Amino acid sequence: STPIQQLLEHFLRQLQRKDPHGFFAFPVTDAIAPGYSMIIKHPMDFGTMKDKIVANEYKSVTEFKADFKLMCDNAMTYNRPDTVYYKLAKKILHAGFKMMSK
Ligand SMILES: CC(=O)c1cc(-c2cc(C(=O)NC3CC3)ccc2C)c2ncccn12
C-alpha cells in the first residue's frame, strides 16, 4: 500500500505479462525440474516476489530488481542454452531491466 509497494506491484504485473506460460509464476520444484534443489541454492519466482511485496520486504526498486535477476540467473544456470527456459530468462531479464530504468 506504500508508494514502493504500489510501484513494485506495477512492475510485477507488467513483468508477468512477459511470461504467459507461467514458467516463472511459482517455485520450480524437483518434480518439475529433476535435481533442481541440489543445483540452485536461492530459488526465486514471481509468486514469492508478490509475497515479498505484500509483506513489505522490498524497500527499494534495486532490491526488487535483484530478486528478479536472481530468478532469471537461476534459470540460466540450471537450464542449458537451447532450452525455452534459458531463452525466456534472457529475454525477460532484458525487458525488466529496460522497464525499471525508464
Ligand atoms: C524456471 C524454470 O527453470 C522452469 C520452469 C518450468 C516449468 C515448465 C512448465 C511446462 O509446462 N513446460 C512445458 C510446456 C513446455 C510449467 C511450469 C514450470 C514452472 C521448468 N520445467 C523444466 C525445467 C525448468 N523449468
UniProtKB/Swiss-Prot annotation:
Site positions per UniProt: Histone H4K5ac H4K8ac and histone H4K5bu H4K8bu binding: I32, Y85
Subcellular location: Nucleus
Top-rank lineage group of the source organism: Eukaryota
Chain segments carrying region Histone H4K5ac H4K8ac and histone H4K5bu H4K8bu binding: 77-79
Domain Bromo, chain residue ranges per copy: 1-101
Record note on quaternary structure: Binds acetylated histones H3 and H4. Binds butyrylated histone H4. Component of the multiprotein chromatin-remodeling subcomplex SWI/SNF called GBAF, which includes at least BICRA or BICRAL (mutually exclusive), BRD9, SS18, the core BAF subunits, SMARCA2/BRM, SMARCA4/BRG1/BAF190A, ACTL6A/BAF53, SMARCC1/BAF155, and SMARCD1/BAF60A. Interacts (via N-terminal bromodomain) with acetylated RAD54. Interacts (via C-terminus) with RAD51.
Role summary: Plays a role in chromatin remodeling and regulation of transcription. Acts as a chromatin reader that recognizes and binds acylated histones: binds histones that are acetylated and/or butyrylated. Component of SWI/SNF chromatin remodeling subcomplex GBAF that carries out key enzymatic activities, changing chromatin structure by altering DNA-histone contacts within a nucleosome in an ATP-dependent manner. Also orchestrates the RAD51-RAD54 complex formation and thereby plays a role in homologous recombination (HR).
Domain free text: The Bromo domain mediates interaction with histones that have acetylated lysine residues at specific positions. Also recognizes and binds histones that are butyrylated.
Name the record gives this protein: Bromodomain-containing protein 9
Lineage: Eukaryota, Metazoa, Chordata, Craniata, Vertebrata
Gene label: BRD9
Residues of the full protein shown: 138 to 238 of 597
